[PDB]
Amino acid sequence: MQILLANPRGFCAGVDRAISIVENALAIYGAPIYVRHEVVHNRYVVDSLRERGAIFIEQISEVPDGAILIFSAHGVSQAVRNEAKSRDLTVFDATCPLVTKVHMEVARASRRGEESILIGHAGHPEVEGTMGQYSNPEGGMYLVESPDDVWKLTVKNEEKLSFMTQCTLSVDDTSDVIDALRKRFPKIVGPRKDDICYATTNRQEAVRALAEQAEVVLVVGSKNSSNSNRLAELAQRMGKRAFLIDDAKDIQEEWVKEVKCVGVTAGASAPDILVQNVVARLQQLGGGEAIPLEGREENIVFEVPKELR
Ligand SMILES: C/C(=C\COP(=O)(O)OP(=O)(O)O)CO
Ligand code: F3S
Structure with a gap:
């Protein structure tokens, strides 16, 4: 292995x-x-x-x-x-600061009375923080998670409309949501692409590359970490077994039993020490020295x- x-x-x-x-x-x-x-x-x-x-x-x-x-x-x-x-x-x-930057744009839309659409996940604290930058009653602040959510949304003035995104979303699902907004609302304005941070973007690309070599992908992160979840989720939709684990204790040996190549990554909130222990645990279940892939510089x-x- x-x-x-x-x-x-x-x-x-x-x-x-x-x-x-x-x-x-x-x-x-x-x-x-x-x-x-x-x-x-x-x-x-x-x-x-x-x-x-x-x-x-x-x-x-x-x-x-x-x-x-x-x-x-x-x-x-x-x-x-x-x-x-x-x-x-x-x-x-x-x-x-990458959240703050998106707060600033929301509050800019609040002041000018104009309506805003956040693409993000209900009940996540980044979402609560960002929607709560909007306070003007003249306009509105609305939440969409998918194209269906977009196909049902109505707005006061679809002429003066902006969108923003949560930083820690799937790059691909977000792309489809934006596609939906531009087609329902041809005047809507937002960023050239999205508000997804460089770290979420990079970790996604990296795990994509990893999941084309590895049969199984372990993603170190806690259950409530959105970005960490996108990593496992990305791997799975490529048809790989992928598990989000807090640490080495969670590795069930059946997951790696007879696996030629296992891949490891980590959400943006998981410390390197957790990954090191996960690597030591894999080496007990039969793996060699950990090899890092080439990657985009941060x-x-x-x-x-x-x-x-
Ligand atoms: C602070 C932040 C991202 C850092 O990773 P976290 O795992 O803390 O957050 P998320 O992926 O949002 O659940 C922006 O939401
Ligand atoms: S929003 Fe900031 S906290 Fe990290 S996952 Fe992105 S750079």
């Missing part, structure tokens, strides 16, 4: 920055540091920090008075941001706020 590793995999720039914001806040002010929602969608990063003294809460009510609060990397709504500010809390915002780094260095 040959182990292949996808390239790129694992940490993106926004995730590295957000985890570092929490560590450096913890280092500058000591436990406890409150954080709204899991800072990133990874069980291991979140138990890692929860035991360094960070406390993960779901509403700003849960956070005391005079306490330090961090917004997660998935971002937050204007309402949340306001409910925090009017409560005398020190606030640090770990929202990935050179983007996002620095923590100056106050947190």
Whole structure:
């Protein structure tokens, strides 16, 4: 059994920055540091920090008075941001700058009264954060997940219409949703393609390449990580067995029994240490040295706020 590793995999720039914001806040002010929602969608990063003294809460009510609060990397709504500010809390915002950029366009559409369509997945926090940038009653903010959702949507003024996308969607399914919007709404405006980040794009291409060599694909990531899910899902629609695993303990040996070539990748929120242990576990079930594929270079780094260095 040959182990292949996808390239790129694992940490993106926004995730590295957000985890570092929490560590450096913890280092500058000591436990406890409150954080709204899991800072990133990874069980291991979140138990890692929860035991360094960070406390993960779901509403700003849960956070005391005079306490330090961090917004997660998935971002937050204007309402949340306001409910925090009017409560005398020190606030640090770990929202990935690639989410912020899409927030800015939403809020631009709110101000000018004009309607906006988000392509994203209901109930995901990035979605809640982004829809909640829209507040103008004159217009609207609408959510679509598929072409069918588009075929049913009606809008006040289809002449002044924009769309935005969640960063961590499938590149292919998103393409079909956009195709649907441009055909129902020939005036709609959005980005030359989508708002999907470079990391989601890259991880997708990489796992596509990996799934054409490997029979089985293991994707390191937590259940609630959208991008990680797109990775497994992509592999599966290529007809490969693919499993989303939190770590080595989840590998069932039947999955790799008699498999000539197994592939490993990692969502943008999964730390390299998890992948290393998954590789050691595969080597016990009979695999050789891990071979990384050639891949597209990533050179983007996002620095923590100056106050947190
Ligand atoms: C913060 C962020 C992506 C980082 O990976 P996560 O696994 O935290 O998030 P997602 O794939 O959105 O569930 C933007 O949603
Ligand atoms: S939105 Fe940011 S958090 Fe990573 S998966 Fe994309 S660079």
